[PDB]
Amino acid sequence: FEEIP
Amino acid sequence: IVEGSDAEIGMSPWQVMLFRKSPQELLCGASLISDRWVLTAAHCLLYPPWDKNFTENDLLVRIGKHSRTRYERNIEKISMLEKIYIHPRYNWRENLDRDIALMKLKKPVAFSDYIHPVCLPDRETAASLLQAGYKGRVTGWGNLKETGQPSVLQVVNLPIVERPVCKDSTRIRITDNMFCAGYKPDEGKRGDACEGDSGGPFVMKSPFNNRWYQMGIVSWGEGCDRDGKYGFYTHVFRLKKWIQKVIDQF
Amino acid sequence: ADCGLRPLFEKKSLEDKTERELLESYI
Ligand SMILES: NC(=[NH2+])c1ccc([C@H]2[C@H]3C(=O)N(Cc4ccc(F)cc4)C(=O)[C@H]3[C@@H]3CCCN32)cc1
Ligand SMILES: [Ca+2]
Ligand code: NA
Numbered sequence: 352f353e354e355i356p
Numbered sequence: 357i358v359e360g361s362d363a364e365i366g367m368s369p370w371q372v373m374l375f376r377k378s379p380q381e382l383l384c385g386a387s388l389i390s391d392r393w394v395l396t397a398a399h400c401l402l403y404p405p406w407d408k409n410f411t412e413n414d415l416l417v418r419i420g421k422h423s424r425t426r427y428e429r430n431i432e433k434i435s436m437l438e439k440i441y442i443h444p445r446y447n448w449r450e451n452l453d454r455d456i457a458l459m460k461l462k463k464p465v466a467f468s469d470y471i472h473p474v475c476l477p478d479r480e481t482a483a484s485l486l487q488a489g490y491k492g493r494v495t496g497w498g499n500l501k502e503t504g505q506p507s508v509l510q511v512v513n514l515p516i517v518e519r520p521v522c523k524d525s526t527r528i529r530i531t532d533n534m535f536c537a538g539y540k541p542d543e544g545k546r547g548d549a550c551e552g553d554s555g556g557p558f559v560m561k562s563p564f565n566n567r568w569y570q571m572g573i574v575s576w577g578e579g580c581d582r583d584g585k586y587g588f589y590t591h592v593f594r595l596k597k598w599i600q601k602v603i604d605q606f
Numbered sequence: 607a608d609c610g611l612r613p614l615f616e617k618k619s620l621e622d623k624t625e626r627e628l629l630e631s632y633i
Binding site: 361364365366367369389467468469470472473474475476485489490491492493511513515560561562563566567568569 | 608609610611612613614615616622623624625627628629631632633
């Protein structure tokens with residue numbers, strides 16, 4: 352998963 | 357979703373991804389029913405046999421998504437949970453009877469082209485649509501096979517199955533709060549929900565008013581897309597009094 | 607009041623690729 356804010 | 361296909365952009369705007377904070381992972385599917393309430397399966401939040409007991413701070417709700425792994429900037433909305441409500445008579449000990457839970461969001465989510473609520477059925481909706489042979493639609497970012505993961509949201513249409521057939525396919529006790537769906541071996545077509553898709557919606561489009569209604573919640577199955585097995589779903593209308601009670605009170 | 611009507615489909619009278627399969631099953 353791409354990192355979230 | 358096994359044997360399904362890529363969803364179209366905005367095809368299921370009520371689709372919600374339940375995302376675990378640490379480690380970061382897909383926990384389950386869910387659905388948007390108002391700007392502040394999200395519906396899912398109780399087993400996504402509470403399942404003692406596997407030491408699963410999530411609290412509000414353990415996860416996030418991601419709405420408006422299409423890509424499974426990407427952070428969809430300017431499109432998805434990430435929401436925190438204020439409170440989780442699990443059906444008080446959810447039977448996790450035996451057969452997942454009453455597999456339903458609600459989550460209230462900390463703040464209302466703004467609707468958009470990619471974020472919009474699904475309707476919940478009333479008694480007439482259920483009587484009209486919950487018939488053997490009538491097809492519903494299941495969506496999710498879960499496994500593509502029982503034994504990888506999709507790049508984007510998957511969709512599959514599946515027929516509701518006669519209750520005797522559902523009953524005869526398993527040793528588990530089926531209740532009135534469940535229905536099953538899927539193709540039979542002799543039908544040729546395939547498809548089922550799988551790990552990662554549970555808690556997600558089984559929806560149907562009313563041919564009377566052209567609106568989508570969430571008739572079920574992905575609840576359980578034995579394996580995924582196995583011949584002679586069917587996916588089981590929580591019967592949303594049968595549990596609607598509980599849904600209304602929770603929303604009316606909180 | 608607007609539940610179940612998708613902005614990119616029902617709201618603009620566009621149909622998705624497989625919704626007709628559902629309609630055909632509602633005999
Ligand atoms: N093939 C399907 N349609 C399908 C649908 C849902 C699931 C679910 C739940 C699921 O099936 N189970 C196992 C189960 C089955 C019957 C019971 F009476 C009790 C428990 C779970 O614990 C849930 C789990 C959580 C990860 C995915 N898997 C598995 C397969
Ligand atoms: Ca049986
Ligand atoms: Na099957």
